[PDB]
Structure formats: structure tokens, C-alpha cells
Amino acid sequence: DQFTIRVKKYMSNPLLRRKQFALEILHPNKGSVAKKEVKERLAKMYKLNNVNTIVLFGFKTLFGGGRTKGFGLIYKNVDAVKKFEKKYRLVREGLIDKETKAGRRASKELKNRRKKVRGT
Amino acid sequence: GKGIKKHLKRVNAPSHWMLNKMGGQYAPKTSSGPHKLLESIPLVILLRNRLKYALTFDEVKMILIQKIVKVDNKVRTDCTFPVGLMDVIHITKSNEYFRLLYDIKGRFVPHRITNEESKYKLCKVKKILLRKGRLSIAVTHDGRSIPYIHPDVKVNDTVRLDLETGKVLEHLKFQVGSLVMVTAGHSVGRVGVISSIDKNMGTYDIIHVKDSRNKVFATRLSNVFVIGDNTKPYISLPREKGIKLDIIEERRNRLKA
Amino acid sequence: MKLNISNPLNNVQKSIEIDDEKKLLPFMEKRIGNAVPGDSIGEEFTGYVFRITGGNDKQGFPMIQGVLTNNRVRLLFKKGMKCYRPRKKGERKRKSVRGCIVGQDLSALNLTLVKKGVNEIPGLTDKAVGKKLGPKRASKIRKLFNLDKSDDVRKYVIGRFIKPKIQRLVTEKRLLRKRNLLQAKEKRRLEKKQQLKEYKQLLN
RNA sequence: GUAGAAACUGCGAACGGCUCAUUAAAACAGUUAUAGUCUACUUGACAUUUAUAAGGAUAACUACGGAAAAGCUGUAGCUAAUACUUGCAUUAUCCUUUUGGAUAAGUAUUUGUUAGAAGGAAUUAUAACAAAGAAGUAACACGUAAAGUGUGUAUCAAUCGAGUUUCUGACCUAUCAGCUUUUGAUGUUAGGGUAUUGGCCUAACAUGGCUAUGACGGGUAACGGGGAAUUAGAGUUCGAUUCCGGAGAGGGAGCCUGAGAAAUAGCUACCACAUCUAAGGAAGGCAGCAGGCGCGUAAAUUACCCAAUUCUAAAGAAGAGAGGUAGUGACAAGAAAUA
């Protein structure tokens, strides 16, 4: 297909070794574009040899379609991706797998396991 | 018990922090340090809400863990550290130097400064205390104690301070020609030349300050900061140059674009 | 009734569960720390002397030193009192406790053997147990081994191979930190000298 | 070296959250003072009367146990620590005049005698003399420039705050007109006590203090304010409830630790309730989040998550019914089908 990519309020942030910006995707008369296509388009535009170093979030399709706004981060490398990004975002990217989903039952267990009441 | 409160509600936070109502229920209570909470911003909001470098408090912590940002050429790692009225903030990874200043609308802005200027901070002496041995110490607005100040320095003077050595370089008086910057009033952020000083016995002393365009505004004596002499400000200023404009004619220059 | 006798010298202890009351009759009306001839409790125990060091009453309440009663009493327990484990700093709690006098209420009795008898008891006076772990302080090791300040004792330690670590060593970092502190004091001295010097110069 | 259950130690748990019972010059608000005080974390200054490194004593752990039961714990044996406790240069000044000799040595705090950059005013800062004198000044742990940090420490200052405090401001009621004063009421003097001032308390003394400009009482279905409804302008009514201040944790009272509590998911006792019990004894405080009963005209899920906001810590990495997300939800509010 065909669409247009637009980068707004772009700024490089070496402190997080990131590059922050806002995405506007013009896809008139056609449905919202999957994140893979915008990933490769951004890779071509910014001359990146690898595609797992970006993260995309906050994608909204607006009213009436033909437009989508979102936020993207360009990372120096995958090591920076893992260092400076949260676990849920890494799981979204698929870079890692889900951890244990016990939740507040861990807190319940910790309350049960009063010190010197469980010798182990 | 009824000890010290340790939370700040968002709407109870200082107005110049510019925190939005719906962005959570709490504001970052600045740690105790060089400056008052009311007359300072925590560097978390300095580089999350102003510089937009960080998007979340955790990203602020991410920045701070690496000993990058230095407040007065020394490394700060506390997330809620009060940066204060005027001083230098050096970010080494991006190699940028900021001076914290006030805009004409009474808000804290990081103003770009050169590396050469990032060594010349200004401190407003608030007290002169003589300790044992007739040794004199100047207590400044920075909460900083400078021992062995020059005996000519008075209680409302200002002193240029070298960040590397922590020494005074020169001092600035408060005559009727010394230009000052107002810090906390209706006229917070204005830069003027001091038209007159009225000293009321036992109450606040008032000073009338003349602007560049010859408009006069009065303020309390404790709310001013000597910046330079009549020749020039000793520090650089933001783009407005401390010149406040009537709202009826700010609109015209906003419209013309 | 379940007398727990401890030989601290042999680092060991043994339990004797008895039911006869005339066997323990000489123990009655003896406070904690009293020495008694523990011969009536058994034939093989004739000769030994036992110090009564504690016990628990019928309901399990322990015994203490101060209270000179024969029954249970309640009293406030402080942070330094022996029969109490505070749950937070400065907390005091009122608990029941049994007096130091022994009667026909002790579900258990703690005793330590002070004087050796004439017979041997298997596992009570035959074998001995060591420290189960060696001392950790360098001065303690030096006292144990008697090698003065000759050489490092890091290779004369006790292991299970795997060995503990020694505190209060003579480590080069421990020396250089003291040296650096001395130099810091000195340099602070010179800066406080010539800073007041230049202050005196600028006084005029 | 990498980690590391437990435990000792450190910090926090005095924040937050909830509710509005009490409360009528009280609380609160604006406006002061603290020259009458305390102040953890954090920040800046910066110290005084065996040493190639000092002492016991304890947890965890091991073995023997008791009790129906509990966040119960006895005895014996060892070991650490930034737990507890002892303890090891030097600087300044006078003069011949870069330099030689000479002289002196307590941080706060208290007492007596003196001299005296700032404030509005000092019995101020500070200095001298004569007496006392705490607590300290590292016997502690990791590593940044192609020396640093952490932890701890005396004092001052800053900061986060707090306690008292000045002036002014409140609803109805006189079928409440005289109150207070032995039992402190008003003031003086001396002291005690406090962090500090003060009848705060004690002793002596004096007879004062308030009041029709409403004292003292009574009522409030009264927490105060920011605010809300209704408004042409005046007004009238409301404000339990996002924020701020106050108060309380069934009702009272008392207390420990701590920088900070008269704390309540801290302790002690009484009253009223109320749980377990083998009947000997233990244990409790939802006006926190859900949820239940009751009361009623009258009000939701015994849900998910720390991702955001932010707090605590030994501070990236852990927690947080704070908080957020969803569920119920015709409380209100906005847009908007039935052509």
C-alpha cells in the first residue's frame, strides 16, 4: 500500500541515549497501518540497520480515520533498549517473555510468613 | 503523631511549577537543601516538565543514577533536589550549561549559558555573622556560608562566586543605580535600576525600581537580587531581558507573526 | 519433671524425665542459682551437684530471678528484661511469669552440673563438643594461637577449603585510609592558613 | 569473587488514608512576634582538656524443653559488627624586622566581673578575666581522574517543619444580668517546671479581672476557611465532603521509644462490648480498603495493578487497598439516534 509518515517535535536525548519524537501517520481512505510498517518506514527514513531498537506507543486513530498520532523512541542499541525501558514495554516489543503473574498473592504470602514463624 | 508532612498534593504545589491538575494526585516534595520549596523547583520537574528529557519520575531517576547532571559544578543524585533561584546546571552527556532564572511571568526557566559563564554564579548575601576570633561569614540566599568575606560587603549586597574554588570574585552594592531582579512579588522577574529606597522603622522597607522603559514598580526589600551596576547585568538574561509588557500590547505582538 | 541437665564444660546436655515426687523433694523451696545435691533423683547421679538455673511452670510460663514467690505473677516487661521479646523499640508489655521458688508446678526444670560425681553418664560427661565455629576477631585468634604480631593469621584459620574472614586486620587499605586522612587534615590546615592569610591581606 | 535464607544493626512506620463526635473568641482566616523556643533527613561551612589498630557480650545457629493455645519462650555453648565500650600529635600569638628565639592552649551549656559588625530597640555577635563542663574531633566500609564515595560525628547557618504569640473577624437566645475570686480568679515578688514565655505550678502579698458595645450561661439537627446555590444591585441560604488548618481512632486516663507521638493496624489500666480456652490462661479495636449486621428515605466490588503520581528504605530492581484501573452507578454534567 501507501502512506505518509510525519515526525514532529523531534529531539535527541543522549542522557537516555534516546531520540524522542511524535508520529503522525497520514493514511487517507484506508485503515490504520500496523506498527511493523511504520517501523520499517522509520528505519528507512533514519537509516537504521535494525528494527528492534525503536519503541512505539500511544497510537490513536483520531476521528474520521485517515490519521494516527503516536510517540516513538529511537535507541542507540538493544542493550540500551533493555537498560532504559520498562518490562511491560519490552514484553510489548516481544524482546522478553512474561514473568510470573502471581500478583498480590505474594503480599498475602509475605504477611502469612511472619518472621520466626516460618523457620525457612 | 504530628511530625513533618512528607507529601505534596498537586493543587497544593507552587503555581510556577505548572503541574497539571489531572496528572496524578501528588507533587514531588522537594528535599530540604539550599533553597526554600516555594522559591525553587526540584530537578525532577526541571528535566521532566521543562527540558522534557524524562517522561516519568523513573526516567528522572534513570538520568540521575549516572552522575551526569551537576548543580553548581557538583554531582546531585537526589530526585527532589531544590535547584533554586539562580545557579548553574551542567549536563555532561549533552554538554549543556543552564542558569536557573525567572521569566517576566514569574516562572523558573533554564537559560542557556556558555561554558565560560557557567563558572560565575551570583549569590545574594542574607546575613553577616561574626564567629569566634572576629571571623566573618556571609550567609547567602543559596543557603551557603562564605567565611572571610571582604568587610565592605553588606547585608543586602551580592557577591560573584566561583563554583570551582568557592571563592568570592567581586561584590556588588545596592545604590540607586545598581540594577536588580525582583524574585517573589507581583513583579517577580522584572529587571530594573532601583529608583529609590524607603526605609520604614520597624516594618518592611520598600524600594521603587525603574524599568528600561521608565516604568516604576515598587517591591519589598527582601524580594530583590542585585545583578549588576548601571553599566550592565553581570549575568546573561532570558530573551525578554526582564522586560514585562502590558497585557493589552503583548496581544498585538502575539498577533503579528 | 523433664529435668534438662547441662554440662557446659563438656558443651553437652541430657534430659531425664522423672515422675516420682520424693526424688525431686530436696529441690523444693530452692531459688534459681541454688546448688543442690542431685543424688535422690537416681543411683548414678549420686555425687554430682546441680545449680537450678530455670524452668517452666505447669502452664508453660517461665521462671525468672527477681520474683520471690511460689506462684505466677504479672508484671511489666522492659526492653532489657530477660523473659521478654519486644516487638518494637521501647515497647513494654505485661505478661504472667512464675516465681523463682520451685514447687510441685514445674512442667520442666533446667539445671547445670557444677561438681563432678563418682559415676559416668553416657553422652553427659563422656564426650565434649567444640566451639562449632572459630573466633572471628584478629585479637581473639592471636590470643588462641599465641603468635604475637609475627605474621598474618589468615592462613591459620579453621574451615569446614572454605574459611571465614577476619576482622580488625592490618590490611594495606586500612593503612592507606589512615594515611589519606592524615594528609586530608594537613591539606585542610594549609588551606585554612593561606585563606586567612589572603583575608588579612585584603583587610586593608 | 559472585550471590545469599535467618539474625543483629540502621532508617521508616509521627507520612499517608478515614471521619466530623467534641468545639461559640475556642478552632479557623487574614495579619504579626518568637529580641521567649525546639527542629530528624537534606545543604554549606568546618573541631577542643597496642596505633602496621584495643575490650567483653549477644542474636542468628546447635542440643535439651514446657504450654490446649498466642507475633510465648527457659537453660547450656560459641561467634561478629557503622550494636555496646575504651583509647594514639599540633596550632595560634610577641619581638629584633623571607628569618631565630620567646608565650598560650575546652565545642555547646551554666555562674560571677567587665569591654562591646548588625538591629528598631541588646543583657546582640564577639572579646577579656575567674570557675565548672556535656558531647565530640573516624580503632568504620566500597572505589573516580587516560585524588573519590558511603556511613558517623561538635558547633554555626540554611532548609523541611513545629510549639507558643499580636491585632481584627462568627449563628440563635435576656422566659440567661451580673459573673470570676476558699478549688488561680486579676496582678506583683521569688522560685519550680518547660524547648522556650506565661498562674503553667508553688509560697508570700495585693484586690483585682470581665460585663447591656450582651459578660456569665443556654441552644446549635455547629469543625472553620478556600468555596456552593440563588443573584439587576443589595441580599438570603448552604459549606460532613478534592485543598488548607483542627480534632479523634469504642469512652476516658497514663506512658515507652523517638528529632518528631501523650501514637492507638505502640504499650498500661479502668468502663462498655467482644474472641479462643482442655477452664489453668491468652487475645481485640475497620471514623484505612473491600465486605457484613444494624439503622434507616437515604449510598457501590470481600475485583486488578504498582504502569502513571508520589512516599519510605540499606533508595533503579522492593513495597504502598496511598494512588491508579476496571465493576455497580438515570447523583450531577456534555454531545447526540428514533430518519
Side-chain angles (χ1 to χ4, degrees), chain B:
Chain B
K2 284 292 309 305
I4 296 98
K5 292 191 176 277
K6 285 163 157 50
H7 293 59
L8 197 44
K9 301 298 186 71
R10 264 204 116 81
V11 303
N12 198 27
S15 43
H16 60 81
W17 288 12
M18 302 205 248
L19 304 172
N20 66 303
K21 300 191 296 154
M22 332 287 320
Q25 220 77 313
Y26 296 105
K29 177 162 204 213
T30 82
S31 287
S32 56
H35 295 87
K36 290 183 181 292
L37 190 141
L38 281 193
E39 334 167 16
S40 75
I41 56 164
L43 82 169
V44 50
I45 83 180
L46 162 53
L47 47 70
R48 172 181 72 173
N49 302 73
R50 305 289 171 272
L51 304 182
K52 319 277 193 179
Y53 278 143
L55 318 176
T56 68
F57 204 106
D58 281 344
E59 289 198 353
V60 193
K61 170 59 99 157
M62 281 316 70
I63 303 196
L64 292 193
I65 278 301
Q66 37 211 270
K67 308 191 170 40
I68 308 306
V69 41
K70 296 149 63 65
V71 184
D72 305 65
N73 94 305
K74 85 175 56 183
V75 159
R76 288 315 175 183
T77 173
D78 191 5
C79 261
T80 64
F81 188 83
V83 312
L85 306 169
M86 92 165 67
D87 39 35
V88 314
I89 308 130
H90 179 23
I91 321 187
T92 69
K93 291 289 281 226
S94 51
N95 183 69
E96 51 206 340
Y97 303 98
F98 296 117
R99 199 182 276 290
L100 246 259
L101 281 186
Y102 274 135
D103 51 8
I104 42 85
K105 270 147 175 200
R107 285 156 317 172
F108 268 134
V109 281
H111 173 37
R112 314 303 273 227
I113 51 174
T114 75
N115 170 66
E116 191 275 10
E117 173 159 23
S118 84
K119 290 137 151 27
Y120 285 174
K121 101 156 296 190
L122 274 169
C123 273
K124 163 191 172 54
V125 40
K126 299 234 245 152
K127 282 201 291 188
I128 294 306
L129 322 173
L130 62 140
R131 284 300 94 102
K132 329 293 282 177
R134 264 248 202 118
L135 102 95
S136 271
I137 308 109
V139 172
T140 67
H141 82 94
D142 201 6
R144 186 191 312 268
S145 310
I146 289 90
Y148 313 110
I149 38 63
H150 182 304
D152 83 309
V153 172
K154 276 323 118 180
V155 81
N156 280 116
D157 277 4
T158 207
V159 286
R160 253 259 310 282
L161 186 81
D162 199 87
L163 284 320
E164 309 87 294
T165 170
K167 256 55 185 324
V168 298
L169 304 180
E170 71 275 60
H171 358 289
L172 299 85
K173 304 332 161 203
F174 36 61
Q175 288 87 10
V176 304
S178 58
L179 81 92
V180 297
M181 171 154 166
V182 178
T183 50
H186 278 307
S187 50
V188 46
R190 327 259 307 256
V191 174
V193 83
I194 286 191
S195 79
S196 146
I197 305 178
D198 298 292
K199 177 164 297 313
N200 329 289
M201 200 172 21
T203 342
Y204 312 106
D205 305 312
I206 317 300
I207 65 200
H208 315 297
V209 186
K210 214 162 151 63
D211 204 331
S212 299
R213 46 255 321 284
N214 318 92
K215 40 181 41 60
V216 165
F217 53 97
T219 180
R220 213 172 267 173
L221 169 134
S222 65
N223 316 340
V224 299
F225 204 123
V226 178
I227 293 323
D229 312 331
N230 38 312
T231 81
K232 50 89 158 185
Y234 276 23
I235 53 174
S236 67
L237 295 181
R239 47 99 174 284
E240 302 322 345
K241 230 63 54 185
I243 292 312
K244 221 188 176 194
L245 276 198
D246 186 10
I247 65 152
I248 87 159
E249 44 86 5
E250 280 186 10
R251 262 323 279 175
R252 77 173 51 126
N253 63 57
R254 279 288 298 287
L255 296 149
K256 59 163 62 142

Side-chain angles (χ1 to χ4, degrees), chain C residues 23-34:
Chain C
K23 278 187 185 183
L24 49 90
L25 194 135
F27 296 77
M28 309 285 99
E29 295 90 27
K30 288 287 218 162
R31 326 181 316 185
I32 303 308
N34 275 151

